[PDB]
Coordinates of C-alpha atoms in Angstrom, one line a residue:
Chain Q
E1 CA 3.0 -9.0 -4.3
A2 CA 1.4 -6.4 -2.1
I3 CA 3.2 -3.6 -4.1
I4 CA 1.0 -2.0 -6.7
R5 CA 2.5 0.6 -9.0
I6 CA 0.0 3.0 -10.6
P7 CA 0.8 5.1 -13.6
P8 CA -0.1 8.7 -13.0
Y9 CA -3.4 8.9 -14.9
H10 CA -4.7 5.3 -14.3
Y11 CA -7.0 3.3 -12.0
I12 CA -7.6 -0.1 -10.4
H13 CA -10.3 -1.8 -8.4
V14 CA -9.8 -3.6 -5.1
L15 CA -12.2 -5.8 -3.2
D16 CA -12.0 -5.5 0.6
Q17 CA -13.1 -9.0 1.7
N18 CA -13.5 -8.0 5.3
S19 CA -16.2 -5.4 4.6
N20 CA -16.9 -7.3 1.3
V21 CA -16.7 -4.1 -0.7
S22 CA -14.7 -3.1 -3.8
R23 CA -13.5 0.4 -4.6
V24 CA -11.6 2.2 -7.3
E25 CA -8.2 3.7 -6.7
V26 CA -6.7 6.7 -8.4
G27 CA -3.5 8.8 -8.9
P28 CA 0.2 8.4 -9.4
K29 CA 0.9 6.7 -6.0
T30 CA 2.0 3.1 -5.9
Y31 CA -0.8 2.2 -3.6
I32 CA 0.1 -1.0 -1.9
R33 CA -2.8 -3.3 -1.0
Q34 CA -3.8 -3.9 2.6
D35 CA -4.1 -7.4 4.2
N36 CA -7.9 -7.5 4.0
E37 CA -7.9 -6.5 0.3
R38 CA -7.4 -8.1 -3.1
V39 CA -6.5 -6.3 -6.3
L40 CA -8.9 -6.9 -9.2
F41 CA -6.6 -6.1 -12.1
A42 CA -3.5 -4.5 -13.5
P43 CA -3.6 -0.7 -14.0
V44 CA -5.6 0.6 -16.9
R45 CA -5.8 3.9 -18.8
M46 CA -8.5 6.3 -17.5
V47 CA -11.5 6.3 -19.8
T48 CA -11.1 9.3 -22.0
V49 CA -12.6 10.7 -25.2
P50 CA -11.6 13.7 -27.3
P51 CA -13.6 17.0 -27.5
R52 CA -16.5 16.8 -30.0
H53 CA -16.4 13.0 -29.4
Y54 CA -18.6 11.0 -27.0
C55 CA -19.0 7.8 -24.9
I56 CA -21.8 6.0 -23.2
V57 CA -21.4 4.2 -19.8
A58 CA -23.9 2.1 -17.9
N59 CA -24.6 2.6 -14.2
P60 CA -23.7 6.3 -13.6
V61 CA -22.8 7.3 -10.0
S62 CA -25.1 9.8 -8.2
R63 CA -24.0 13.5 -7.9
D64 CA -25.3 16.6 -6.2
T65 CA -25.5 20.2 -7.4
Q66 CA -21.7 20.3 -6.8
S67 CA -21.6 17.1 -8.8
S68 CA -19.7 15.6 -5.9
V69 CA -19.6 11.8 -5.7
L70 CA -22.0 10.3 -3.1
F71 CA -20.1 7.5 -1.4
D72 CA -22.2 5.0 0.5
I73 CA -21.3 4.3 4.1
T74 CA -20.9 0.6 3.5
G75 CA -18.1 1.3 1.0
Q76 CA -19.9 0.8 -2.3
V77 CA -20.2 3.8 -4.6
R78 CA -23.7 4.9 -5.3
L79 CA -25.1 3.7 -8.6
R80 CA -28.0 4.4 -10.9
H81 CA -28.5 0.9 -12.2
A82 CA -31.3 1.2 -14.8
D83 CA -30.1 4.7 -15.8
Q84 CA -27.4 5.3 -18.4
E85 CA -24.7 7.9 -18.8
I86 CA -23.3 9.9 -21.7
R87 CA -20.2 12.1 -22.0
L88 CA -18.7 14.5 -24.5
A89 CA -15.5 15.9 -22.9
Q90 CA -13.9 16.9 -19.6
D91 CA -11.1 15.9 -17.3
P92 CA -9.9 12.3 -17.6
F93 CA -11.6 10.0 -15.1
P94 CA -11.3 6.6 -13.4
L95 CA -13.9 3.9 -14.2
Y96 CA -16.1 3.6 -11.0
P97 CA -16.8 0.1 -9.8
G98 CA -20.2 -1.4 -10.8
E99 CA -20.2 0.7 -13.9
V100 CA -20.2 -0.9 -17.4
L101 CA -18.4 0.9 -20.2
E102 CA -20.2 0.7 -23.5
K103 CA -19.7 3.4 -26.2
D104 CA -16.2 4.8 -26.3
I105 CA -13.9 6.9 -28.5
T106 CA -17.0 7.5 -30.6
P107 CA -16.8 10.5 -33.0
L108 CA -19.5 13.0 -32.4
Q109 CA -22.5 12.7 -34.7
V110 CA -21.7 15.0 -37.5
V111 CA -24.6 16.3 -39.6
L112 CA -24.3 17.9 -43.0
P113 CA -26.8 20.7 -43.9
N114 CA -28.8 18.7 -46.4
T115 CA -29.6 15.8 -44.1
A116 CA -31.7 15.3 -41.0
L117 CA -32.1 13.1 -37.9
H118 CA -35.4 11.3 -37.3
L119 CA -35.8 10.5 -33.6
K120 CA -38.3 8.7 -31.4
Chain P
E1 CA -17.3 -22.1 5.0
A2 CA -19.3 -19.8 7.3
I3 CA -17.8 -16.7 5.7
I4 CA -20.2 -15.2 3.1
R5 CA -19.0 -12.2 1.1
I6 CA -21.8 -10.1 -0.4
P7 CA -21.2 -7.7 -3.3
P8 CA -22.6 -4.2 -2.4
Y9 CA -25.9 -4.4 -4.4
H10 CA -26.7 -8.1 -4.1
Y11 CA -28.7 -10.6 -2.0
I12 CA -28.9 -14.1 -0.7
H13 CA -31.4 -16.4 1.0
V14 CA -30.7 -18.4 4.2
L15 CA -32.8 -21.1 5.9
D16 CA -32.7 -21.0 9.7
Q17 CA -33.4 -24.7 10.4
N18 CA -33.9 -24.0 14.1
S19 CA -36.9 -21.8 13.5
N20 CA -37.4 -23.5 10.1
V21 CA -37.5 -20.1 8.4
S22 CA -35.7 -18.7 5.4
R23 CA -34.9 -15.0 4.9
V24 CA -33.3 -12.7 2.4
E25 CA -30.1 -10.8 3.3
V26 CA -29.0 -7.5 1.9
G27 CA -26.1 -5.0 1.7
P28 CA -22.3 -4.8 1.2
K29 CA -21.5 -6.6 4.4
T30 CA -19.9 -10.1 4.3
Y31 CA -22.7 -11.5 6.4
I32 CA -21.4 -14.8 7.9
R33 CA -23.9 -17.5 8.5
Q34 CA -24.8 -18.5 12.1
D35 CA -24.7 -22.1 13.4
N36 CA -28.4 -22.7 13.0
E37 CA -28.6 -21.4 9.5
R38 CA -27.7 -22.6 5.9
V39 CA -27.1 -20.5 2.9
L40 CA -29.3 -21.2 -0.1
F41 CA -27.1 -19.8 -2.9
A42 CA -24.1 -17.7 -4.0
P43 CA -24.8 -13.9 -4.2
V44 CA -26.9 -12.7 -7.1
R45 CA -27.5 -9.3 -8.7
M46 CA -30.5 -7.4 -7.3
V47 CA -33.5 -7.6 -9.7
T48 CA -33.4 -4.4 -11.7
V49 CA -35.0 -3.0 -14.8
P50 CA -34.4 0.3 -16.6
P51 CA -36.8 3.3 -16.6
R52 CA -39.6 2.8 -19.2
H53 CA -39.0 -0.9 -18.9
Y54 CA -40.9 -3.4 -16.8
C55 CA -41.0 -6.7 -14.9
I56 CA -43.5 -9.1 -13.4
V57 CA -42.9 -11.0 -10.2
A58 CA -45.1 -13.6 -8.5
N59 CA -46.0 -13.5 -4.8
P60 CA -45.7 -9.8 -3.9
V61 CA -45.0 -8.9 -0.2
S62 CA -47.6 -6.9 1.7
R63 CA -47.1 -3.2 2.3
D64 CA -48.8 -0.4 4.2
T65 CA -49.5 3.2 3.3
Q66 CA -45.8 3.8 4.0
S67 CA -45.2 0.8 1.8
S68 CA -43.2 -0.7 4.7
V69 CA -42.5 -4.4 4.5
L70 CA -44.7 -6.4 6.9
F71 CA -42.5 -9.1 8.5
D72 CA -44.3 -12.0 10.0
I73 CA -43.4 -12.8 13.7
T74 CA -42.4 -16.4 12.8
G75 CA -39.7 -15.1 10.4
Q76 CA -41.4 -15.6 7.0
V77 CA -42.0 -12.5 4.9
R78 CA -45.7 -11.8 4.3
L79 CA -46.8 -12.9 0.8
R80 CA -49.7 -12.5 -1.5
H81 CA -49.7 -15.9 -3.1
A82 CA -52.5 -15.8 -5.7
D83 CA -51.8 -12.1 -6.5
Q84 CA -49.0 -10.9 -8.9
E85 CA -46.8 -7.9 -9.0
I86 CA -45.6 -5.5 -11.7
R87 CA -42.8 -2.9 -11.7
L88 CA -41.6 -0.1 -13.9
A89 CA -38.6 1.5 -12.2
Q90 CA -37.3 2.5 -8.7
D91 CA -34.4 1.7 -6.4
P92 CA -32.7 -1.7 -7.0
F93 CA -34.2 -4.4 -4.8
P94 CA -33.4 -7.9 -3.3
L95 CA -35.7 -10.7 -4.3
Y96 CA -37.8 -11.6 -1.3
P97 CA -38.1 -15.3 -0.4
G98 CA -41.2 -17.1 -1.6
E99 CA -41.4 -14.8 -4.6
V100 CA -41.1 -16.1 -8.1
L101 CA -39.5 -13.9 -10.8
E102 CA -41.2 -14.1 -14.1
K103 CA -41.1 -11.1 -16.5
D104 CA -37.8 -9.2 -16.4
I105 CA -35.8 -6.6 -18.4
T106 CA -38.8 -6.3 -20.6
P107 CA -39.0 -3.2 -22.7
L108 CA -42.0 -1.0 -21.9
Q109 CA -44.9 -1.6 -24.4
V110 CA -44.4 1.0 -27.0
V111 CA -47.4 2.1 -29.0
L112 CA -47.3 4.0 -32.3
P113 CA -50.1 6.5 -33.1
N114 CA -51.8 4.5 -35.8
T115 CA -52.2 1.3 -33.7
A116 CA -54.3 0.3 -30.7
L117 CA -54.4 -2.3 -27.9
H118 CA -57.4 -4.5 -27.6
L119 CA -57.8 -5.6 -23.9
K120 CA -60.1 -7.9 -21.9
Chain M
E1 CA -12.4 -21.5 8.9
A2 CA -13.5 -17.9 9.5
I3 CA -16.0 -19.0 12.1
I4 CA -14.6 -18.6 15.7
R5 CA -16.8 -19.8 18.6
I6 CA -15.9 -18.2 21.9
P7 CA -17.0 -19.7 25.2
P8 CA -18.8 -17.1 27.4
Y9 CA -15.9 -16.2 29.7
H10 CA -13.0 -16.6 27.4
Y11 CA -10.7 -14.6 25.1
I12 CA -8.6 -14.8 21.9
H13 CA -6.0 -12.6 20.1
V14 CA -6.2 -11.6 16.5
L15 CA -3.6 -9.9 14.3
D16 CA -4.9 -7.5 11.8
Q17 CA -2.3 -7.7 9.1
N18 CA -3.6 -4.6 7.2
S19 CA -3.0 -2.3 10.1
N20 CA -0.4 -4.7 11.4
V21 CA -2.1 -4.7 14.9
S22 CA -3.2 -7.5 17.2
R23 CA -6.1 -7.2 19.6
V24 CA -7.8 -9.3 22.3
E25 CA -11.4 -10.3 21.8
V26 CA -14.0 -10.9 24.6
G27 CA -17.5 -12.3 25.4
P28 CA -19.8 -15.1 24.5
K29 CA -20.2 -14.1 20.8
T30 CA -18.8 -16.4 18.1
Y31 CA -16.8 -13.5 16.7
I32 CA -15.9 -14.5 13.1
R33 CA -12.6 -13.2 11.8
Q34 CA -12.5 -10.5 9.1
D35 CA -10.6 -10.9 5.8
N36 CA -7.7 -8.7 6.9
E37 CA -7.2 -10.6 10.2
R38 CA -5.7 -13.8 11.5
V39 CA -6.6 -15.6 14.7
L40 CA -3.6 -16.3 17.0
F41 CA -5.0 -19.2 19.1
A42 CA -8.0 -21.3 20.2
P43 CA -10.1 -19.8 23.0
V44 CA -8.6 -19.8 26.5
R45 CA -10.1 -19.5 30.0
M46 CA -9.9 -15.9 31.3
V47 CA -7.0 -15.4 33.8
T48 CA -8.6 -15.8 37.2
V49 CA -7.5 -16.3 40.8
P50 CA -9.5 -16.9 44.0
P51 CA -10.1 -14.3 46.7
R52 CA -7.1 -14.2 49.1
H53 CA -5.0 -15.6 46.3
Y54 CA -2.8 -13.6 43.9
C55 CA -1.1 -13.4 40.5
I56 CA 1.6 -11.4 38.8
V57 CA 1.5 -10.3 35.2
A58 CA 4.1 -8.5 33.1
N59 CA 3.4 -5.4 31.0
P60 CA 0.3 -3.9 32.6
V61 CA -2.0 -1.7 30.5
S62 CA -2.4 1.9 31.5
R63 CA -5.5 3.1 33.3
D64 CA -7.0 6.5 34.4
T65 CA -8.7 7.4 37.6
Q66 CA -11.8 5.6 36.3
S67 CA -9.3 2.7 35.6
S68 CA -10.6 2.8 32.0
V69 CA -8.3 1.1 29.5
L70 CA -6.4 3.5 27.3
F71 CA -6.5 2.2 23.7

């Protein structure tokens, strides 16, 4: 079924076979698939963690000083493959394609006065 | 099937029987094979390792001061056969034909202050 | 089969279902179809008539003073 309802704060990925390129989709709109494309999966809650909580995601997308996403001309999102990403809190966000979620909903590392954190 | 979808950061090799020469292919495009050619394999993730990690690959391609790849006129990539190659981190890359991957995803050799590394 | 060989002076039509729009294709190239598209038919000789001979075709395309096709 070409019809694809999306709950308002959710996302999906779709592979455009003609250009051979997947992309994430966002927003409330029931974005129907086009003829060249194929939906990867049913809609999923946007990756979110509470304030003073954190999450770690592989393959962060590149950003400028404006932190604007840098789309590639061929239709892939730009990705820092070897590099990782960490997040505390901000606006809810779609999972970008080619990223790999790892740590999530992790409580922020509390530290009592009498203890300490050895680091390398 | 002549159609050959390629995921955006992936590569494949194809042997052109007419000129009897293989070559790597790159990028998001669903590069269809030509009549003279035959695909070697299904698309594979580009060889990548994290920063402060390393990998070793046999048969490095030649490069100039610009580190530009030196394509041979006959269609083979240039190769340093006896010589090896090592890599720490940079942009994700296709595996060039005639190369042989060896070490990969290897953590960089950590060294604590009290120890030492005997070498030959 | 996505592969579509075209003889050098021939043409085919292809419907792009995503934009819901057909278009003609031209030239020697073995123009492979894209994922969104579907070939209408096998390649056909270009419509041609000899000098001091004539032909009539319905639904002419628009043209400018340059007689350029108006897509």
